C-alpha cells in the first residue's frame, strides 16, 4: 500500500522494507480509526457519565463498552529480539495504560450483580487513560500532518491550525463538563446541556459569577481543577490566536524590519532627502516588498531544478535574440545559470565611456540608450545585450549607456563569461562578429577584436549578426 | 491612468498591458468607493436594524436599498477563455455572495404588500455577506497599502496600524451592537446608543456584570456569540498593541542583543575590566548604537546607487586633497568604492614601524601622529593618507603612526590598491612622487620607489606632491 | 571530588586548582542543602507565622530556630588578599543579610521573658531575608542546571521548566498565604488551609469576589501588595506557559517560515503550478521537514568528530564497492569528508552527454540509468559511482545519466577530486583502469585516459575493476 | 562643557561645532530640569485639581503658576536661515503647544476678579499640553539613555527598564486619579488618597466591582476613558514585564535553540546513541553553553583591538615556550592573530601517521601523547606545538598524536604558516632546527628538512631548540 512508500519516503526503501518484513500499513489505518473513536469517547465520557444518573444498559453504554474493548485490543496489539522489545514496551507504558483501561462498566455491572454507586462510578474516571491514549494520538496526528506535508496546499495559511483550535475548544468543553459535574457530585436535557456549554464559554471568557463557598473539601478541589483547566484553555487559545496573528503580520514585518535596518544605515550616514527617496524607490522597484535570498534559494536547490528555474525565468530572452535560439541547449543553459539579476532606475549610467568594464548586461525589461560622441543616440529594447566589446577586447568601454526607463537586466561577470566562452569556442566567434559589426556601426576602431575574429557555422554567425544589428538599429 | 503604471510597476509593462487590453483602473477606484460604502453599511446594519423597530420607508432605508443595489451591481461586474473563467469565478464564490446579497428589504416589502416581522428581519442578517465582501476589502486594502508602499513616509512608524486598530475598534463596536440586540430580541435614542457603546467598552475591558440567566436557548446562544466576539476583540487589540510596542522596543533590543552576544564572548574568554571597557567604548564609538550590515546593504544595492552613496560619504575626502580633485571621475569613484571603514581609538598604534603592511588609510575624521627615530613627530590632520610607501615598495613600514584622538579612517586593501593602480597607471607615478617627497622629508631610503618613479602631467603631479607635503607639514 | 572537575570543566584544570588550594566542593553541597532548607522555611513562614497564633515553643518552632541558626552559620561562612575580599563582601551584601537574618524568635522570647505581640511577630517578616537568600538560590540552581547541562536527556523538552513553574506555583501560594494573613491582621485547620489555597487559586484565575472596603490603611496596603503579587504570579505563569508552547510551535514554524520564504520567491518569479509542485516535492523529499545547516554544523565541529560522522553516514557506500574496502583508511576518510549531499527526483537528467562536467557522483540511495546512442540502457544501483570519465579526461561527457527513482547521491567536486587524487596517486590508476573498462564496455574511445592508465597493486586494481564492471553490468 | 563632546561623539567634531557656534549644552540641562518639573506637575495636576475644591491662592498653586511660567519660557526659547526655521517650527508644533500652555490659573483668577467654576476648572485640563511636552521628554530621555549608553554597567540587565515601568505605574496612577475625578464631577485627605490609589490598583488588576449606571452622558464617557486608559496600563505593564522575562529566558533559549537544530540534524542522519552523546559532550565542552560567533566578533573589531584580545588569550602560550619570548613582537602578534581555536576529547586522534597534514597545533590546555613505532610514547604538555615537520617538509606525517585528556589547542593553517614564515625568514630556520632535533629524537629521516636547515642568532636558535627538546622530553 501507499503507507510503506509514505513511511520510507521513496519506493526503493519501501521495497526493501517490504522484503525485510516478508523475510521475517493497514494496522496504521486501524489505529487511526481507533484513535478517532477513543477521542470521541473521551470527549463524551465527562458529558455522558456525569450527566447520566446510571448506565442502565443503554445502547450508548453498549457502544462505550465496545469502544473500551477496542481500546483493550489496541493495547494488546501494541504489546505484541521481539520478546525483549515487547517486554520493555510493556514495562514502560503499556502495562500502566492497560491497567488503567480496565472495563470499569463491566466491573461495576459484576459488582452490582454480585454512596457506593458514586464510588463505583468514580472508577469511570479511568477515561484519563483514554486521554493519555489521546495524547499519543495528538503526537500521531502531528506525524500525520507531517505525512500530509501542508495538505499539498497552503492556500489560507495553516488550515490544520483550525483543527488544533477546534480541539482546544473541545478540551475547554471538557472543562465545562467537569464544571457541570462538580455540583452534580456536590448535590430539559438539551436545555441543561446548552446551559452548561454557555457556562463553559463564560468561564473561558472570565465574565464573572457569584459562585463560591464549596463547603465540601472535594467540592473545593473540584472548583480548583476547574479553574486551572479553564486557565489552560485560555492560555492555549490566546497562544494559538497570537501565533496566527503574528505570522500574518510577520508576512510583511520581515520586509519592514529589513527596510528599517536600511533606514538606520541611511540615518547613520546622513544621506540627503533626495538620495533617501531614490534608495527607497529602488528598494520598492526591486524587491517589490517581498523577502527572499535568491542566492541562498538557488544554492539550496539541486542542479536540474535551478537549471529549469533559470531557463524559465529568461524564456523570452532566449527566444528573442537569435544567438541563443541557434545555439545548443548546453551552452545556453550554462550561460543562463551564470546570469545575475539587477534593476536600474532611469537616469542611472550603467556603463560610462572610458571606464574599465567587468560584466555584460542582457536586457529583459525596459530600454537602454547608447550614446557617444558624434554618433548620436540609439536605443536597445527588450532582448538585447551590451558590454560585449569590453569583455572580448579586455579594454576600456567605447560608448556610454544610460537607462531612460525602469529597466531589469541580467549581468554576466567577466570570470563566468570567459569560462563559458572558453568551454564553448564557437560563441566566441559569434560574439566577435556581432561586436565587430556593432562597433563598425558606432564608428570607432578595434584592432584586437578584428584580429581575433579573423562553412555553415560562419553563415549562421553572419545571419545572427545581421539579425542583432537589425534589432539594435532601432 | 496611473493605475496601469502602479499595477505593472513600470511604464514599459503598463504600455504593453494597455496595448493588450486594446487588442482584446477606473473600475478599481469604483470598487474602492463601493467597498468603503459597503464597510459603512455593514457597520451600520447591526446598529440600524436592531435599534430601529421597522424600516418604515425611511430615507436611510432608501440609502441602504441603494447600497444593496450597488453591491449587487458590483457582484454582477465581478461575474462578468473569458466564458470559462467567468463560470469558474461564479461557481467558486460569486454565486454564493450574490445569493446572500439578495434584496432583503425589497423582499420584506413585497411580502408585507402581498413574530413574522422578526423572522423577516432575520433575513437582514444577510449583512454577513457584506461582511464577507469586507473581508475581500481588507485583503484589497492590504494590496493598497502595498501600493502606498509606506505612504512614502514612515515618520511615526506604521500609521496604517492606527487604521487597523480603528477597524478593530469598529468590529468591537459591532460586537457591542450585537450585545445590545440580544435583549432586544429577548424582549433618548442618543442616551441608549451611548449606553450601548459604554457596555461594549466594558465588555472589551471585562469589568464584570451580574447579567445571567438568558432563559431562552436563542438568548443563551446570542450571549455565547457575544462573548466569543468580545474575546476576539480583546485578542486582536492586545496583539496589535503588543506588536506596536515591540517594534519600538526591538529598535533598541536588536543592538542590545548583539552587544549581549559580544558580552557573552567577552566573559567566555575572561578579559580584564579595562579591556572590557575599551571594547565597549569602541563599540559605542563605531556603531553609535545602531544595527546594520554595511557590506550586505551595499551589496544588495545596484552599482550606480552604491557608487553615489560612496561618492557622497567621501565628499570631503575627495575635495580636500588635490590628488583626487585633479583625477578623472572614473578612478576616483572606483577607488572610493573599494574603501572600507575603520575607527581607531586614541593610543592605538595603527601602523608599527618594521611590520609588513597590507592596507592604506585615508583620514576622514581626526588626526594621527607619525613618529619615528631622530625625526621628531609630525601630525596628519583630516583629509590625508598614510601607508602608500609600503604599498608601492612592497616592503616593511618605515615610520610608526599613532592615533591621538578618536579617528575615523577608510582603509584600502593591498589587492584593491594594486588592481586600481594597475588599471590606472598615472596615479602610480602620482603616488610615487608624493611618497618619494614624503620619505625624503622623513629621511629614510626608498631606492626601489625612487627607481620606479624615475609634460603637463608631470607638472600636475609635482603640484599635487607640493600641496600634499604642505598639508602634511603641520 | 567531582565538584572540582565540574567547576574547572576538565581534569587538567581541576588538578591545578586542587594544587593551588593545597598550596594556599563539599561546602557547595552543604550550601545546596541549606538553600533547600531555607526555601522550605521561606515557603512555610507565611503559612506558619500567620496561621499560628503563637510559637508556644512548638517542635516546628524549634525546627525553625535551627534553620535560622543554620542560615546564620551559612552567612558567617560566606563572610569568611583574603581580608580585603572578605571585608568587601561583608560591606556589599553580607552585612545586610546577616542583620536581616537576626533570630527574631529568640529576640521575641527574650523580650517576653524580660498589640505588642503583633508588633513583635512583625519582626518575623524578616523571612524576606530568607527570600533574598532564595533569590541567590535560584541563581545558584540556574548555575546547577548549567552543571546538569540538559540533565543529559532532553527527552520531553525542558523538564527543568516544570520545576520552574512549580516554583512559580509555590510563589503564588505564598501570595495566597499573604492574602489569608491580611484579614488575620485586620481581625478545622485543614479546612481553613484548603479554603485559603482555593482562594489563592481563584485570585490567580481572577474569578472575582465582592471583597472590598479594607477600612484600615494597613489593610488597604495589604490588599494592594496581594493584588500586585497575584499580578506577578499571573504574568510569570502566562510567560512560562507561552514560552513552552512556542518552543514546540517553533519546532515546525522554522521550517514553515523557510518554505514561506521559498513561496514568496516562487510567487515573485511567477512559476507555473507544475514547477511549484515539483519544487515543493523536492523540498519535502530532501529536508524531510527539518531545519539545519549541514555546512554550518559540520564546520563548527572539530576534525575527528566530522570525520567519524561522515564515515558513519557513508558506511554502506564504503562497504559496498571494493575500491573503498581495499583502500587505506586515510584516503577513504578524506574523500568521504569532501563529499556533498544531493537528491534527484525521477526524470531529472543528472548528466547530459556533450556537457562539460565539474563533479562526479556516488549513489547511496536509488538507481540511475545510463543511456546513450546504440548501446541501449543500463542501470547503476546503490553503491556505485558515475562521472569519473570526465573528471579524469577533463573533457566532455560521454553518456547521459537519468534518475528514474527518487535518488540520494553524494557528489565530489572537480577541485576536491583532483586534490585528493594528487595526494594519493594509486587511486588515480585505480579509477583509470575502472573507467577504461567502463568506456570500452560503452563503445566509445578515450585516448587520453588510456595513455594515462598506461605487481600486487596491479592485480588488486584489476580485481576491483572486474568487481565494479560486474556490479554495473546490471 | 562635556555636552558638546557627548553630542558630537568626539573632541575633533566638538571643537569644530564650538568654532562654528562662535562664528555665528547648559540649555540642554535647563531643559532637562524643566522636563522633570513638567513631568511632576503633569502627575500632580489630575491629583491636585480634582482633589482640591479650589486653588484658593495656595502656596502649591503659586508653585504650579511658576511651573506654568517656566513651561511658557521653555516654549518661547524653543520658538527662538534662522527666521525661516523658527517660523516653520512655530507653525509645526510650537504654536499649538504654546496656545495649549495658556495660564489657565491666571485666566481663571482674572475672570473671577472681573457651575461656572467647574467650566473654568475644565480649562485646567490643559495639562494635556504638559503631557505632550512629557512625550517630547520621554523621547528626550530615550536620547539621554543613548547618551548614558548602558549606564556604563549592565550589571542587572536593563535598569532603565525599572524607570520605564515606574513611569508606567505613574501613568496608571494618573488613570486612577481620573477614575477618582469621575464621581467628583458626577457629584481624611490621606485616607481618601490611599483609597483612590487602592481603587487604581484594583482597576489595574481587574478585580471587579459593582459600579455601573453612570446616568450622566459625561459620566459615561468618563468611565469609558477610565476603562481604556486602564487597558493601556495593563497592556504596557504586561508588555514590559514579558520583555524583561524573555530577555533572561532567551539568554539560554538561544543556545537551546542552536542545540535543538543540532539535534534535528543528528536525528535526520540517525546517528547511534554513543555518537550523539559524544557530540553533546563536545558541544558542552567547547561552547560551555554560550552563544557567540568568534569569527564574526573578531571580524567586526578593528585591528588593534583584535590584536590585543588575541595577544591576551595566548599570554601563557607566548610566555611558555622560549621561541615566542625571544621573537620580536610583530611576528608573535601576527602568528597569534592567525591562530584558530579547537578542542579535542580524549581518545581522538588529532594527527594520524601517514596522512597528509594541513595545519599545526599549539597546546594551550591539556596534554597530548605522541606515539609511533619502536620509539615508545612521549607526552607533550601545555605550551608546546606539534605538526611543524609536515608543514616544513610538505610531506606525510611521521608520528601519530592522540589526545588523552580534554585538550584545548590552537591550530595554524598551512597557508597562514607559509605566509607568516615567508614574511619572517628567521623563524623558518628556528622551526627547522627544532624539528630536526625532534625528528632525530624520534628516529626517522628528514633529509629535505635537514638540507633546508643547512652568530648570535644561531646561538639563540640553538638555545631555543634545546629548551623545546627539554620541554617535549617530559
Ligand atoms: N553602434 C552600436 N550599435 C550597437 N551596439 C553598440 C554600438 N555602440 C556601442 N554599442 C554597445 O554598447 C556597449 C557599451 O560598452 P562596450 O564598449 O563594452 O560595448 C558596447 C556595445 O555592446
Ligand atoms: N616625513 C613624512 N612626511 C609625510 N608622511 C610620512 C613621513 N614619514 C612617514 N610618513 C607616512 O607614514 C607612513 C607609515 O607607514 P608607511 O611607511 O607604509 O608609509 C608612511 C607614509 O605614508
Ligand atoms: N558502459 C558503461 N559502463 C559503466 N559506466 C558507464 C558506461 N558508460 C558510461 N558510464 C558512466 O556514465 C558516466 C556519464 O558521464 P561521464 O562520461 O563523465 O562518465 C560516465 C561513466 O561513469
Ligand atoms: N621525538 C619527538 N619529539 C618531539 N616531537 C615529536 C617527536 N616525534 C614527532 N613529534 C611531533 O609529532 C608530530 C606529528 O606530526 P608531524 O610529523 O607533522 O610533526 C611531528 C612533531 O611535531
CA of C474 to the centre of ligand 3 (A): 13
Count of H-run helices and E-run strands, chain D: 23, 8
C-beta separation of A238 from A152 below 8 A:
no
Half-sphere exposure for C80 (CA within 13 Å, toward CB)? 6
Torsion sign (Cα): A76, A78, A82, A85: negative
Q: Which three three-digit cell numbers place residue D348?
A: 581522538
Q: What is the C-alpha to C-alpha distance for residues C52 and C72, in angstroms, rounded to an integer? A: 24
Q: What is the C-alpha to C-alpha distance for residues D430 and B451, in angstroms, rounded to an integer? A: 35
**Cell 502627575 appears where?**
D43
**Cell 615537520 appears where?**
D389
Q: Is B441 in the pocket of ligand 2 (CB under 6 A)?
A: yes
**If 0-12 CB within 10 Å is exposed, 13-18 middle and 19+ buried, where does residue B245 land?**
middle
C-beta separation of A398 from A439 below 8 A:
yes
CA of D389 to the centre of ligand 4 (A): 7
Whether A13 and chain C come into contact, CB under 8 Å, resolves to: yes
**Cell 455565547 appears where?**
B224
Say what the resolution is, in angstroms. Answer: 3.6
Q: Which CATH number fits domain D302-472: 3.30.70.1520, 1.40.20.10, 2.60.120.10, 3.40.50.880?
A: 2.60.120.10
**Cell 550589571 appears where?**
D155
Length of chain C: 474
**Cell 508653585 appears where?**
D63
Ligand nearest to the CA of B439: 2
Q: What is the C-alpha to C-alpha distance for residues C351 and C336, in angstroms, rounded to an integer? A: 21
Q: Which of residues 421-450 of C touch D (CB under 8 A)?
A: 423
C-beta separation of A343 from A286 below 8 A:
yes
Whether B56 and chain D come into contact, CB under 8 Å, resolves to: no
Q: What is the C-alpha to C-alpha distance for residues D289 and D273, in angstroms, rounded to an integer? A: 21
Neighbours of B5 (CB within 10 A): 17
C-beta separation of C470 from C437 below 8 A:
no
* Contact call for A330 and C354, based on CB within 8 A: yes
* Closest to D391 in 3D by CA, of D443, D335, D324: D335
C-beta separation of A231 from C234 below 8 A:
no
D253 chain-C contacts, CB cut-off 8 A: 243
CA of D377 to the centre of ligand 4 (A): 11
Q: Which of residues 231-290 of B touch D (CB under 8 A)?
A: 237-238, 241-242, 245-246, 249, 253, 256-257, 259-265, 267-269, 271-272, 275, 278-280, 282, 284-286, 288-289
Say which DSSP state D382 is in: S
Q: What is the C-alpha to C-alpha distance for residues C436 and C445, in angstroms, rounded to an integer? A: 9
* Contact call for A297 and C262, based on CB within 8 A: yes
Cα first-last separation, chain D = 63
C251 chain-D contacts, CB cut-off 8 A: 260
* Contact call for D305 and B278, based on CB within 8 A: yes
Helix axes B59-79, B82-89, angle to 10 degrees: 130
Q: What is the C-alpha to C-alpha distance for residues B223 and B26, in angstroms, rounded to an integer? A: 44
CA torsion, ordered A316, A317, A323, A329, to nearest 10 deg: -80
Q: What is the C-alpha to C-alpha distance for residues D173 and D169, in angstroms, rounded to an integer? A: 6
C-beta separation of D167 from D134 below 8 A:
no
Q: b vs e for C390-428, b when ≥16 Cβ sit within 10 Å of the residue's Cβ?
A: bbbbeeebbbbbbbebbbbbbbbeeebbeebbeebeebb
Helix axes A127-147, A26-49, angle to 10 degrees: 140
In this complex, the chains that touch C, judged by 3 or more CB pairs closer than 8 A, are A, D
Q: Where are the domains of chain C?
A: 2-218, 302-472
Q: What is the C-alpha to C-alpha distance for residues C465 and C431, in angstroms, rounded to an integer? A: 8
* Beta-bridge partners for B416: none
What are the start-end ranges of the E strands in B142-219?
none
Cα first-last separation, chain B = 63
* Contact call for D208 and C208, based on CB within 8 A: yes
Spell out the residues 6+ positions from residue C51 whose beta carbon is closer than 8 angstroms to its own: C180, C184, C189, C192, C193
C-beta separation of B323 from B383 below 8 A:
no
Neighbours of C97 (CB within 10 A): 21
Q: What is the C-alpha to C-alpha distance for residues C432 and C453, in angstroms, rounded to an integer? A: 5
Technique employed here was: cryo-EM
Breaks, C-N > 2.5 A, in chain C lie after 24, 80, 114, 187, 454
C-beta separation of D45 from D134 below 8 A:
no
Q: What is the C-alpha to C-alpha distance for residues B18 and B332, in angstroms, rounded to an integer? A: 44
C220 chain-D contacts, CB cut-off 8 A: 194-195, 198
CA torsion, ordered B427, B433, B435, B437, to nearest 10 deg: -160
Q: Which three three-digit cell numbers place residue A59?
A: 445502547
* Closest to C381 in 3D by CA, of C349, C347, C405: C405
Q: Which CATH number fits domain B303-472: 2.60.120.10, 3.10.350.10, 1.20.1440.230, 3.20.20.140?
A: 2.60.120.10
C-beta separation of D360 from D372 below 8 A:
no
C-beta separation of D431 from D321 below 8 A:
no
A254 chain-B contacts, CB cut-off 8 A: none
**Cell 538585447 appears where?**
A384
C-beta separation of D65 from D37 below 8 A:
no
**If 0-12 CB within 10 Å is exposed, 13-18 middle and 19+ buried, where does residue D352 land?**
middle
Q: Which three three-digit cell numbers place residue B189?
A: 435614542
Q: What is the C-alpha to C-alpha distance for residues B67 and B65, in angstroms, rounded to an integer? A: 5
Amino acid at each position: 500500500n501507499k503507507f510503506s512508500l509514505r513511511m520510507f519516503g521513496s519506493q526503493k526503501a519501501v521495497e526493501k522494507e517490504q522484503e525485510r518484513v516478508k523475510t521475517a500499513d493497514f494496522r496504521f489505518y486501524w489505529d487511526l480509526i481507533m484513535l478517532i473513536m477513543m477521542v470521541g469517547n473521551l470527549v463524551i465520557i465527562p458529558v455522558g457519565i456525569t450527566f447520566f444518573t446510571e448506565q442502565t444498559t443503554t445502547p450508548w453504554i453498549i457502544f462505550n463498552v465496545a469502544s473500551d474493548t477496542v481500546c483493550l485490543l489496541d493495547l494488546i496489539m501494541n504489546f505484541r529480539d521481539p520478546k525483549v522489545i515487547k517486554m520493555n514496551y510493556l514495562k514502560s507504558w503499556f502495562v500502566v495504560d492497560f491497567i488503567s483501561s480496565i472495563p470499569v462498566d463491566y466491573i461495576f455491572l459484576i459488582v452490582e450483580k454480585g454512596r457506593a454507586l458514586r464510588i463505583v462510578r468514580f472508577t469511570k474516571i479511568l477515561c484519563l487513560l483514554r486521554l493519555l491514549r489521546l495524547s499519543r494520538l495528538i503526537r500521531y496526528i502531528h506525524q500525520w500532518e507531517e505525512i500530509f506535508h501542508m495538505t499539498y496546499d497552503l492556500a489560507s495559511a495553516v488550515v490544520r491550525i483550525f483543527n488544533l483550535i477546534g480541539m482546544m475548544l473541545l478540551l475547554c468543553h471538557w472543562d465545562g463538563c467537569l464544571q457541570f459535574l462538580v455540583p452534580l457530585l456536590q448535590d430539559s436535557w438539551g436545555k441543561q446541556y446548552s446551559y452548561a456549554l454557555f457556562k463553559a464559554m463564560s468561564h473561558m471568557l472570565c465574565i464573572g459569577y457569584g459562585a463560591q463557598a464549596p463547603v465540601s473539601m472535594s467540592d473545593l478541589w473540584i472548583t480548583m481543577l476547574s479553574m486551572i483547566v479553564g486557565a489552560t484553555c485560555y492560555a492555549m487559545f490566546v497562544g494559538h490566536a497570537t501565533a496566527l496573528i503574528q505570522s500574518l503580520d510577520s508576512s510583511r514585518r520581515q520586509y519592514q524590519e529589513k527596510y528599517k535596518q536600511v533606514e538606520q544605515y541611511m540615518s547613520f550616514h546622513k544621506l540627503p532627502a533626495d538620495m533617501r527617496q531614490k534608495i527607497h524607490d529602488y528598494y520598492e522597484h526591486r524587491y517589490q516588498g517581498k523577502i527572499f535570498d535568491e542566492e541562498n534559494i538557488l544554492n539550496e536547490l539541486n542542479d536540474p531544478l535551478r537549471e529549469e528555474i533559470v531557463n524559465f525565468n529568461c524564456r523570452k530572452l532566449v527566444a528573442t535574440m537569435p544567438l541563443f535560439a541557434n545555439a545548443d541547449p548546453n551552452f545556453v543553459t550554462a550561460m543562463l545559470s551564470k546570469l545575475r539579476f539587477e534593476v536600474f532606475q532611469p537616469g542611472d549610467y550603467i556603463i560610462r565611456e572610458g571606464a574599465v568594464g567587468k560584466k555584460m548586461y542582457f536586457i529583459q525589461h525596459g530600454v537602454a540608450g547608447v550614446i557617444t560622441k558624434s554618433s548620436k543616440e540609439m536605443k536597445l529594447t527588450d532582448g538585447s545585450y551590451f558590454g560585449e566589446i569590453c569583455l572580448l577586447t579586455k579594454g576600456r568601454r567605447t560608448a556610454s549607456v544610460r537607462a531612460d526607463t525602469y529597466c531589469r537586466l541580467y549581468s554576466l561577470s567577466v570570470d563566468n563569461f570567459n569560462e563559458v566562452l572558453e568551454e564553448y569556442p564557437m560563441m566566441r566567434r559569434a560574439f566577435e562578429t556581432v561586436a565587430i559589426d556593432r562597433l563598425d556601426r558606432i564608428g570607432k576602431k578595434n584592432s584586437i577584436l578584428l584580429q581575433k575574429f579573423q562553412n555553415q557555422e560562419n553563415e549562421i554567425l553572419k545571419q545572427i549578426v545581421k539579425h542583432d544589428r537589425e534589432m539594435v538599429q532601432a
